[PDB]
Design a protein around this ligand. Structure first.
Ligand SMILES: [Ca+2]
Ligand SMILES: [Ca+2]
Ligand SMILES: [Ca+2]
Length: 111
């Protein structure tokens, strides 16, 4: 087992919602294990989140998948997906979201 820690999620420049400012949250997977989701950062085009995510059964080269969604009343909209293979150490990354904006994040993979 290796330990993965995913943290410092933030987005710059989310697009408009159908009505007003987007209500973003991030869902986190590692090797298709569901690691959970952040709270919704309501009415914020440039959110950052305090939440962090750990996975104590990771392996090097597992695929980290980050999904940025907009919360809505009837159907949430998936704005973008960032995927990469995890490497030992601490790494900072950014990702351009299909529907607009850029996601920045860090992770640490250990032991
Ligand atoms: Ca929407
Ligand atoms: Ca809103
Ligand atoms: Ca919304």
């Amino acid at each position: 087992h290796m330990q993965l820690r995913l943290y410092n999620l933030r987005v710059r420049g989310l697009p408009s919602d159908l009505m007003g400012i987007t209500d973003g949250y991030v869902k986190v997977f590692c090797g298709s294990a569901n690691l959970g989701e952040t709270s919704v950062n309501h009415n914020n085009a440039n959110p950052w989140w305090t939440e962090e995510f750990s996975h104590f059964k990771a392996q090097e080269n597992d695929i980290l998948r980050l999904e940025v969604h907009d919360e809505d009343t009837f159907f949430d909209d998936l704005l973008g997906v960032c995927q990469r293979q995890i490497k030992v150490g601490t790494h900072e990354h950014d990702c351009y979201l299909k529907e607009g904006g850029t996601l920045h994040y860090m992770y640490t993979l250990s032991v």
